[PDB]
Design brief:
Blueprint lengths: L13 H7 L31
This protein binds one RNA strand of 90 nucleotides through loops.
Length: 51
Amino acid sequence: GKRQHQKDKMYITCAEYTHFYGGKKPDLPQTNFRRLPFDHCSLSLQPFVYP
RNA sequence: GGUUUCUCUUCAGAUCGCAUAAAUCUUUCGCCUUUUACUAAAGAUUUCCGUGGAGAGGAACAACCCAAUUUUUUGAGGCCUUGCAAGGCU
């Protein structure tokens, strides 16, 4: 045997199944940095005048 | 009692081998009509060219000097009192 067609195999390959068909994605970062600047109103998301 | 040299069995931990091949399978890659033959990395399992320890049998070559301080060549023996022991003695 020679592994001649390894991307196109008779089944779904392991990497292909992970990336497209419901394998576990690594999912590393989640909302790493989402902080409003201190000078901004939380409701308006714009610089406050009367804090 | 020894050494050398062949065959077989068994166990291999040691860089088993200051050397280094191939095959099979699974992952990823490169080739791109299909299959041989392949490109190159990881992991797993075998084969092959060699090696070490132990045991058994065969054959060949050799042989049944301190006595003078610090130790071991003596300060060694004798008397008195009390309940051999202690002390005083010579």
